[PDB]
Amino acid sequence: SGFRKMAFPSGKVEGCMVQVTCGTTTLNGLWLDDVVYCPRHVICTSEDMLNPNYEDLLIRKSNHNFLVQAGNVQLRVIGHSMQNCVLKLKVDTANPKTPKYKFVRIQPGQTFSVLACYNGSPSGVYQCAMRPNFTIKGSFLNGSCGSVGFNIDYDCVSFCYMHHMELPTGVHAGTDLEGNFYGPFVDRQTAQAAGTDTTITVNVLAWLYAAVINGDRWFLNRFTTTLNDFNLVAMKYNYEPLTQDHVDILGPLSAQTGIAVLDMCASLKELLQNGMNGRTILGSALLEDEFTPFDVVRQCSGVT
Amino acid sequence: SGFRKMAFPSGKVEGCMVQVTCGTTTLNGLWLDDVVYCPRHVICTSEDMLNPNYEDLLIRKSNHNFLVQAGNVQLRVIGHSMQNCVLKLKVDTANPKTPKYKFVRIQPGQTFSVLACYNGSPSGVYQCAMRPNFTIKGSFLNGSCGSVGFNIDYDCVSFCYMHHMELPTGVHAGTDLEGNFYGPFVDRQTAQAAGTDTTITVNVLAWLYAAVINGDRWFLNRFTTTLNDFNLVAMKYNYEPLTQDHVDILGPLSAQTGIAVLDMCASLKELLQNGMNGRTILGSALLEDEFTPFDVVRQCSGVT
Ligand SMILES: *CCC(=O)N(c1ccc(C(C)C)nc1)[C@@H](C(=O)Nc1c(C)cccc1CC)c1cccnc1
Ligand SMILES: *CCC(=O)N(c1ccc(C(C)C)nc1)[C@@H](C(=O)Nc1c(C)cccc1CC)c1cccnc1
Structure with a gap:
């Protein structure tokens, strides 16, 4: 007996966390098969967060500008594309630790585990829920971007969330693994107030x-x-x-x-x-x- | 920002969980190097829990009576010994996933993460604390015995708890990895009331x-x-x-x-x-x- 706020074991997801650096910005990426997924705001500079034109910013970037590191070893980037608010970086090596996985878009009220990461390294795991106002009450510091939310059914990890930002009220907003934000949030440093929680x-x-x-x-x-x-x-x-x-x-x-x-x-x-x-x-x-x-x-x- | 009850990432510990069966009892074991650690009450039958004489019960057991399974593969037991309330089963194969580790005995008030397991398989991870009365308020069902508590310092896992039992009041009692119980509890189905929490x-x-x-x-x-x-x-x-x-x-x-x-x-x-x-x-x-x-x-x- 006893009832605890329990998260799924994080091992299968830990084996997928990588560090992605574009210029001076470093965040977390999710390496599944030969694709690394990360928030597209990795390409943004300081004077870009206010009103970024991601397509225009992306034109100035080549495959060699995305530095992907898995542990102490560098991955070779052979392609890059933007799908909604996430970047998909094709690498030349399939992640040998890729678990069975699905990408799912969850509904509000549904729960998931979050593996909070910094510099591609896991620091903690907690259980949370997608709020009815499409925010999450997480524990994310600067550099946590790219940390992911997931559920596990025996051996299949269903990835449902990727962290993108903190709203001015301290609550969190992110996307599914197709890059679509939950709720009306945008990856822009602008006035975004959340609805009734x-x-x-x-x-x-x-x-x-x-x-x-x-x-x-x-x-x-x-x-x-x-x-x-x-x-x-x-x-x-x-x-x-x-x-x-x-x-x-x-x-x-x-x-x-x-x-x-x-x-x-x-x-x-x-x-x-x-x-x-x-x-x-x-x-x-x-x-x-x-x-x-x-x-x-x-x-x-x-x-x- | 945001503050969550965060557990350590459990991957390093997941790679150590095995199933131990002795006769009809199945619980979790912790496989580090060529030793599998588990609660000694794995040798107890139904009419033994009341007043077990572990040394006498252990005489009727040989190496071949301890079935150790890591995933879908069986480990060969080449030795067995009892250290306080834990059994140490020497196997012929060192766990290839053994992380850097220490065994530590924590003080009350200190926190740790628990990887709850059943049949040697991890089901969840949560953060808890050793209460000042030496109990833990966990989430453990029948078969969770042998699930472990730990802290991680970069790449070194410090194992501090192994689950042994639930007290009649629904709170939990266990040992450090040397088999010494925290508090005055005994691995016996007897009246054990906890002190002031x-x-x-x-x-x-x-x-x-x-x-x-x-x-x-x-x-x-x-x-x-x-x-x-x-x-x-x-x-x-x-x-x-x-x-x-x-x-x-x-x-x-x-x-x-x-x-x-x-x-x-x-x-x-x-x-x-x-x-x-x-x-x-x-x-x-x-x-x-x-x-x-x-x-x-x-x-x-x-x-x-
Ligand atoms: C991983 C990047 C990061 O830490 N954060 C960030 C910075 C810029 C952007 C976009 C280019 C706009 N997204 C995310 C922050 C973050 O969201 N900062 C922030 C706060 C705290 C409040 C209002 C606006 C912004 C955007 C600048 C971050 C910090 C803590 C937790 N998650 C994300
Ligand atoms: C892994 C074994 C198990 O699930 N439990 C158990 C059974 C027997 C023994 C000893 C031989 C005495 N230890 C542990 C139980 C458990 O502790 N059951 C129990 C409860 C719930 C209340 C009072 C006494 C006992 C002992 C029989 C278990 C169940 C749930 C969580 N942890 C352990």
Whole structure:
């Protein structure tokens, strides 16, 4: 028992991290097969961040201007192209450590692990979620650009995020591995405010199920509610609307605990209205929303 | 910016996880050089957990009774010995993935990463701390035994914990890699209650420093205190006593922020006395104590 914010083991991704330098800028790249993926803003200078014309900046760059280093050894760049906001640098050597992989574009509320890197070297791994406003609350310093988000299904790594920037409010924005930003963000040093960071309701309910499985049951009440009644409360507290799809996804947790989804919604409703009164759930004094129903089942069953 | 509960990248440890089976029991082992380390309770049957005599149980076991599997391949066991509560199984093949490593016995309040494994396969990585009562609040299911705790200094993994058991209260107990339990726990299915889980004061202060660096400064007050005055409040709230050694360890964070350690103690004192009034610090509604001063500096500087 016990419930932790668990990240996937990072070994398979560690074997893909490289350093990419273009002129004076150094960031992280992701080496899969004979292609190194990195944020296109690696080509930007200091007086470029304000309003960069990436196509024009890219014309002044040749294959030899992209320095790619994997460990202590240099990779030879034989081609380069820009796909949306990422650069794809073709190298002459396929990464011998390339795992089975997919590129996936995740939906808000979905979770993933991040391997934070600097100079192509991994420094840490943490679990986070794509917020409903398409930002991520990460831990990224200058040089972390190019660090990636991923999920693992047995031996297949599904890459879903590449870090590009920090917004003026300290939250993070990035792309999928096709270079498309999550949300309306642009790779430009300009005024970009994030929308309402609403709570991921289905994730909170999954975590309330995790709490019941692990013995924290004080919040369980004698009430029930309806999807419409619950949603009126959820809107009031800036919680995402709960749909019948969410109820369906929570089915296995409802079945394991014998607590119907709508009864758990009524427990959640009373926690929103009354607060926690100085009590804790799974060692937290607030309602946790960065565990999906899939994560709760996976961690509670020990999927390797 | 941003501050996350970050674990070390787990790749180096993933390459050391093996499955150990003795009779009908399967748990995790740690393969370093030509030795596989695992909890000695792998030799216990069902009617043994109550009061096992490990030396007597071990006499009935030969090298061929310990099945060690690394991936899909079997390791040949050429020797076995018991060192305290761990078994050391000598194999005929040195692990080709053995990283530079040390075995260290950590002190309470120190943090480490855990690679939770089942059947010798890694399923997740999380960061935790050795509690002042020598338990760990982990996420371990049946079969997780043998999963290990570690810290990494550039390329050297310092193994500090091996999981052995869950206490009747859902908290976890284990040994260092020499087989010595942390705390007074024994590898026996018997009444073992944990002591007071006090808060790691130096860690809370480090995390308050992390908050100030990341912009969360609302809790900073106009007060100061003394070590003795602060400690009277800390005892009242089951916080560990703060020593001059702790003040010294917080020196770099005090210097970076310009906030003297005793002023941060006075802020912490007011948070203990007044509570958070529904506010949050670094996304938490309670005072976090599983980041050491070293972790705060490392995460805030990006040590790879
Ligand atoms: C890897 C590059 C980097 O660290 N950062 C960066 C710098 C420039 C650009 C574009 C050319 C605009 N993108 C990323 C920063 C970063 O995003 N800095 C930043 C902050 C902190 C706030 C507002 C705007 C900007 C852009 C200059 C970085 C720093 C910390 C974490 N992630 C990224
Ligand atoms: C790897 C073995 C295992 O999963 N567990 C176990 C079983 C037996 C023994 C000894 C022979 C006594 N040690 C460990 C359990 C475990 O500790 N079970 C347990 C619990 C949950 C509560 C009170 C006592 C015991 C011992 C039987 C395990 C389960 C979950 C997490 N860690 C370990």
